[PDB]
Design a binder for this molecule. Structure first.
Ligand SMILES: *[C@@H]1O[C@H](CO)[C@@H](O)[C@H](O)[C@H]1NC(C)=O
Ligand SMILES: *[C@@H]1O[C@H](CO)[C@@H](O)[C@H](O)[C@H]1NC(C)=O
Ligand SMILES: *[C@@H]1O[C@H](CO)[C@@H](O)[C@H](O)[C@H]1NC(C)=O
Ligand SMILES: *[C@@H]1O[C@H](CO)[C@@H](O)[C@H](O)[C@H]1NC(C)=O
Ligand SMILES: *[C@@H]1O[C@H](CO)[C@@H](O)[C@H](O)[C@H]1NC(C)=O
Ligand SMILES: *[C@@H]1O[C@H](CO)[C@@H](O)[C@H](O)[C@H]1NC(C)=O
Ligand SMILES: *[C@@H]1O[C@H](CO)[C@@H](O)[C@H](O)[C@H]1NC(C)=O
Ligand SMILES: *[C@@H]1O[C@H](CO)[C@@H](O)[C@H](O)[C@H]1NC(C)=O
Lengths: 595, 530, 48
């Protein structure tokens, strides 16, 4: 008879009726992604229209009772997520424009093609062709030409587009009783009503700054070595005191430094830990590649796969006639259906990605007992981090020897650990200054701290100070460099990767300490450890029911962000950086001395 | 520790005459100058008794125990030591052990790992078993002890009591009579079917002296015991040896005067035990319960009452696809012979993960809101995969379940209400608004799910007994009628003993069994074949 | 002995044998824990 019992009777019915439609929305999306055809497109559109309207039709019917009188933490959390206005708080005309603004950025980016002037007979798209020349070509001007030409054309066609994007996004957040749209993303980590585990949305920015103050010393030595290595590749175009040119990061945005292994190889003579030749020699098909993983995932304690997964999931390219989406994605179809969409190759990377996507799936049925609306990670960082940690163990040479990929007679010399650690530093340590700067920049443009005519100048000066990368030429306000990224132009959260990076090492150390490992973190593995899985399984089963601070404390013992696992992982490499950085200068200067 | 012995000599078992040995004082009472008749387990007179000899002869085999054992040992220097008892002679089951060392007598009842060749070794060694985990009974007493030593023992296992008798006599078996006296009773309470013997080896690599022991088997029979004026048994008569001794056992005397006497009657005892019941007809219709084209939803579970028929639960138990056969409160084996007044077939279809909720004392969506099972539930539940039938690629929405109710459903209560559930302050008024949804959700199955979520057709059998005559019985097996032989017949509850032969009698069609002038059942009609 | 032999969560210290191939003799004790067989298929140490 109490209002709280009303909330108790409102969620389970909403959860199951969503499950019937969420699967159909997911299955039609899966049916579209397994074989693209015109009917599969409209079934997704019909399901997507039905799924989007079903949430909206209950959104109108979920926001007329106060939430201060409901005591059940899971129930209160479920209603707060459903009450979130989203795009429903604006008027119909504004919502019709905001979605089109979102749509017009996607179609411009998807069809974004840059080709050489005086050669219009055929042009080249960004994802298929421009990405190939982005890391394999060793020409300064040709790579600079593509870097300048893309942002010049794309920036002109997105700068007016992003101006309407930021004002409309900021208006919705203020209409949602939020200070800025950056706080709307910060609202995913919001925890309320729990003592000891309470978290503030505005605390995340200083927590990121607090975490980053120790990332910088590790990054500066990594930056100096890369600059010293790229000094050999480019003798005079990089100053020893200035920042790196913006078009020499291995990618257009500089997000990933993994492309610089050949450029920045410490010991090229020694062979790598790759055992791909053994995979093809022994004919390790994708069926047994995942079956080898299944042996590993049950060794730590996680459950095995079901009959539904193997039958319906495609682990190989279907063929020419059957066109399918090849992007590796784990599908939580709901109602106990979990499928992995991967056009898997017989390679080391796909073997590592197989663990990553199954770990995403292995995360899904852990909270299968949770309510459907709570059938998500406590924050956007756990879902990706739990998949990243298991690829860390899969790359250990000890695992490869155990499953026979690596010969038992191979010697893990110090250099191959240094070389492997550098590659992981490129993908993790290198991206953090870029991961922080974009989110920090976006947090202010939604706040309005940066002047509206000073967006790009503010963008460049911090990139020199944060990432240590200098622009080739000054860019005026007529262009929009930041919007060229996939995440920003499609309204995608970017702080997830920053939290995933910290959770990945925090979880790795916690698993390694649980597994009673006698060596460093990089050599550590979670195989043949029973207690590691159960400690891991505690947060996986909770899902979003318990605060992410509580889930973190159940694993690492600390509710807040911790960076100590990250530096411990790269400590053998960090000391190696210090030894060879005596000649080079650690750090950079904000001046444009290089270019 | 076990030591394997390979100096044995292979020889078939010898035999010899028991004569009149193996008579023990049947009770504790003194009697003098009285010819008393007793009926117990005894060793038959002049029977075959197995002969064992050790010298290079080494005899220590495994012998059956049966109802009893008479053990003798014409011995010198006392090589023989003790005995072993049990059913498997290892720590899978409880076992007994008896030893007689040079100092005392040791009896242990513990769960030994007996060696392949237990033995002993003056005495300065011991090799009988390797381990003994759970020991129950222990005891200690005084040592029991041209061949000169003759020992005789009797072992019985009745009502958990191990009766032991003994007698020593200074001297093939001798031609003489001497009764055995009770020695020790042990309340072991174990099962015994085989027994061994214990030997002490002499080393001078081991040399065995000349020793011989005999093993008999006791049988249930009547003896006639004569007590002298000093209370000592001096003579006996086996009441079932030969017709002459049967006359003495009937006249209660040892000398029979000239004449003709009537002792006992001739009995061609039976052989089989033929039970017959009518043909297996009027079967309970369980086919449409499990082979049904459609199954009802879990919230609206179909209830089927079964009566006035014979219930063949063996058919359901014999189908492999019925993977989960969980029965609570009643043994699955005795479902046939047990009789119930009414059986309620409760059919429904649920997901894979909610199967555990179909059990007494369980909770969940199904247990509390769809189907509740009482704690004192008598019956079985059967679950089988139904992905090939209850799943559609587009989705099988035909199944619905109940999720919300003001309280947990009562046992065996079905709820099909469709009114919009009311929870708190503001009335719903039948409007699917905020905090007001339909009280029913729909199971929507697809053939793309795993073992944990596939639709399972689960039917629960509710067993009850009422004041009304329980007309649901199991099948009654009928052995092939035996003819021309004494058998223990049981026809439609008519019990008796005798030889069943053919009949020339012309029974009338309604007549079942015929009687003689003595008013006793002499003719009977088989229900299987009239 | 409801005070001393009842646990709120449930006392499982007491066990009773449900299945056996035959009835015991009077005052006879059985402590065998081997898996009972009900069908023609031999157990082979499997509780299936
Ligand atoms: C190809 O796409 C169609 C679109 O409806 C789909 O029905 C079909 O199953 C797909 N082919 C395969 C082999 O799955
Ligand atoms: C509140 O209800 C949820 C069910 O949605 C339950 O999991 C939780 O334990 C309840 N909390 C309290 C304090 O009753
Ligand atoms: C969503 O928008 C409606 C309409 O303005 C408003 O009443 C409701 O409070 C909003 N939701 C939240 C959680 O504030
Ligand atoms: C997963 O494990 C369970 C029990 O350990 C087993 O019954 C099942 O067959 C396994 N699944 C596969 C695909 O092997
Ligand atoms: C690795 O460690 C060994 C051990 O002394 C040392 O000799 C070698 O120089 C080290 N190499 C690097 C690259 O640190
Ligand atoms: C871990 O367990 C698997 C399962 O038997 C085994 O094959 C493997 O050798 C074990 N790992 C090690 C390092 O022994
Ligand atoms: C002993 O057994 C043999 C063969 O079984 C038989 O011929 C003989 O008559 C038996 N002896 C006695 C005394 O019954
Ligand atoms: C009974 O005992 C007395 C004296 O001990 C003895 O004279 C007599 O012979 C005994 N009777 C028998 C039948 O041996």
């Amino acid at each position: 008879s109490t209002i709280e019992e009303q909330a108790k009777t409102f969620l389970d019915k909403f959860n199951h009726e969503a499950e019937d439609l969420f699967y159909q929305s997911s299955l039609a999306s899966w049916n579209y992604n397994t074989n693209i055809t015109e009917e599969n497109v409209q079934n997704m559109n019909n399901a997507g229209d039905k799924w989007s309207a079903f949430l909206k039709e209950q959104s109108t019917l979920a926001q007329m009772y106060p939430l201060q009188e409901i005591q059940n933490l899971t129930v209160k959390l479920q209603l707060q997520a459903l009450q979130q206005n989203g795009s429903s708080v604006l008027s119909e005309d504004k919502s019709k424009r905001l979605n089109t603004i979102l749509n017009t950025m996607s179609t411009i980016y998807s069809t974004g093609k840059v080709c050489n002037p005086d050669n219009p007979q055929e042009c080249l798209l960004l994802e298929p062709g421009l990405n190939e020349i982005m890391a394999n070509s060793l020409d300064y001007n040709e790579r600079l030409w593509a870097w300048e030409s893309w942002r010049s054309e794309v920036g002109k066609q997105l700068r007016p587009l992003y101006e309407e994007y930021v004002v409309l996004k900021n208006e919705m957040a203020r209409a949602n009783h939020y200070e800025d749209y950056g706080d709307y993303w910060r609202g995913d980590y919001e925890v309320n009503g729990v003592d000891g585990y309470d978290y503030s949305r505005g605390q995340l920015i200083e927590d990121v700054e607090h975490t980053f103050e120790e990332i910088k010393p590790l990054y500066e030595h990594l930056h100096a070595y890369v600059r010293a290595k790229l000094m050999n590749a480019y003798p005079s175009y990089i100053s020893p005191i200035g920042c790196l040119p913006a078009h020499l990061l291995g990618d257009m945005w500089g997000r990933f430094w993994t492309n610089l292994y050949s450029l920045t190889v410490p010991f090229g003579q020694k062979p790598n830990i790759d055992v791909t030749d053994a995979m093809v020699d022994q004919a390790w098909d994708a069926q047994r590649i995942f079956k080898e993983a299944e042996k590993f995932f049950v060794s730590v304690g996680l459950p095995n796969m079901t009959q539904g997964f193997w039958e319906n999931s495609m682990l190989t390219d279907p063929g020419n006639v059957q066109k399918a989406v090849c992007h590796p994605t784990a599908w939580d179809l709901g109602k106990g259906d979990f499928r992995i969409l991967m056009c898997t190759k017989v390679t080391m990377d796909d073997f590592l990605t197989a663990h990553h996507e199954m770990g995403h799936i292995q995360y899904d049925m852990a909270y299968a007992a949770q309510p459907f609306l709570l059938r998500n990670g406590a924050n956007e960082g756990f879902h990706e981090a739990v998949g990243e940690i298991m690829s860390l163990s899969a790359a250990t040479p000890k695992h490869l020897k155990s499953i026979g990929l690596l010969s038992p007679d191979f010697q893990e010399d110090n250099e191959t650990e240094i070389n492997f650690l550098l590659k992981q530093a490129l993908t993790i340590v290198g991206t953090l200054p870029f991961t922080y700067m974009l989110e920090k920049w976006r947090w202010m443009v939604f706040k309005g701290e940066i002047p509206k005519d000073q967006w790009m100048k503010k963008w460049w000066e911090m990139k020199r100070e944060i990432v240590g990368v200098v622009e080739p030429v000054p860019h005026d306000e007529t262009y929009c460099d930041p919007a060229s990224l996939f995440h920003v132009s499609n309204d995608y959260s970017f702080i997830r990767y920053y939290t995933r990076t910290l959770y990945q090492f925090q979880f790795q150390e916690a698993l390694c300490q649980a597994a009673k490992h006698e060596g460093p973190l990089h050599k550590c593995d979670i195989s043949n450890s029973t207690e590691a899985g159960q400690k891991l399984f505690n947060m996986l089963r909770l899902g979003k029911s318990e605060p992410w601070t509580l889930a973190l404390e159940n694993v690492v013992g600390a509710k807040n962000m911790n960076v100590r696992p990250l530096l411990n992982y790269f400590e053998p490499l960090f000391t190696w950086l210090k030894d060879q950085n005596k000649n080079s200068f650690v750090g950079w200067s904000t001046d444009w001395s290089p270019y | 520790q076990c030591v394997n012995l390979t100096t044995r000599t292979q020889l078939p078992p010898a035999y010899t005459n028991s004569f009149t040995r193996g008579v023990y004082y049947p009770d504790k009472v003194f009697r003098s100058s009285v010819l008393h008749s007793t009926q117990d387990l005894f060793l038959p007179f002049f029977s075959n008794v197995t002969w064992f000899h050790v010298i290079k002869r080494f005899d220590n085999p495994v012998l059956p125990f049966n109802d009893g054992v008479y053990f003798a040992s014409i011995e010198k220097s006392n090589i023989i030591r003790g005995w072993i008892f049990g059913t498997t002679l290892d720590s899978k089951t409880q076992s007994l052990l008896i030893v007689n060392n040079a100092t005392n007598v040791v009896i242990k009842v513990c769960e030994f790992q007996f060696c392949n060749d237990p033995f002993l070794d003056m005495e300065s060694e011991f090799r009988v078993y390797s381990s003994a985990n759970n020991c129950t009974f222990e005891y200690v007493s005084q040592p029991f002890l041209n061949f000169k030593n003759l020992r005789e023992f009797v072992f019985k296992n009745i009502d958990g009591y191990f009766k032991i008798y003994s007698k020593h006599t200074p001297i093939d078996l001798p031609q003489g009579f001497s009764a055995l006296e009770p020695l020790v009773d042990l309340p072991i309470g174990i099962n015994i079917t085989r027994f061994q013997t214990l030997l002490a080896l002499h080393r001078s690599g081991w040399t065995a002296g000349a020793a011989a022991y005999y093993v008999g088997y006791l049988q249930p029979r009547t003896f006639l015991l004569k007590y002298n004026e000093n209370g000592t048994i001096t003579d006996a008569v086996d009441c079932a040896l030969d017709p002459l001794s049967e006359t003495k056992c009937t006249l209660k005397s040892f000398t029979v005067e000239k004449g003709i006497y009537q002792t006992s009657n001739f009995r061609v005892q039976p052989t089989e035990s033929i039970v017959r019941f009518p043909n297996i007809t009027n079967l309970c219709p369980f086919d449409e319960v499990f082979n049904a084209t459609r199954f009802a939803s879990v919230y609206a579970w179909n209830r089927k009452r079964i009566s006035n028929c014979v219930a063949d639960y063996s058919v359901l138990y014999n189908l492999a696809p019925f993977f989960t056969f969980k029965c609570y409160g009643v043994s699955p084996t005795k479902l046939n012979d047990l009789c119930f007044t009414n059986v309620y077939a409760d059919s429904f279809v649920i997901r894979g993960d909610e199967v555990r909720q179909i059990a007494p004392g369980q909770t969940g969506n199904i247990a509390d809101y769809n189907y509740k099972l009482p704690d004192d539930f008598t019956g079985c539940v059967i679950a089988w995969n139904s992905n090939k039938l209850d799943s559609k690629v587009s989705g099988n929405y035909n199944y619905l379940y109940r999720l919300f109710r003001k309280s947990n459903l009562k046992p065996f209560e079905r709820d099909i209400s469709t009114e919009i559930y009311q929870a708190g302050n503001k009335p719903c008024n039948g409007v699917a608004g905020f905090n007001c949804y339909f009280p029913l959700r729909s199971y929507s199955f697809r053939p793309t799910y795993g073992v944990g979520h596939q639709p399972y057709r689960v039917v629960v059998l509710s067993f009850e007994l009422l004041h009304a005559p329980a007309t649901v019985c199991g099948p009654k097996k009928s052995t092939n009628l035996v003819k021309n032989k004494c058998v223990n017949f049981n026809f439609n509850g008519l019990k008796g003993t005798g030889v069943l032969t053919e009949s020339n009698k012309k029974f009338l069609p309604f007549q079942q069994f015929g009687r003689d002038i003595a008013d006793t059942t002499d003719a009977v009609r088989d229900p299987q074949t009239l």
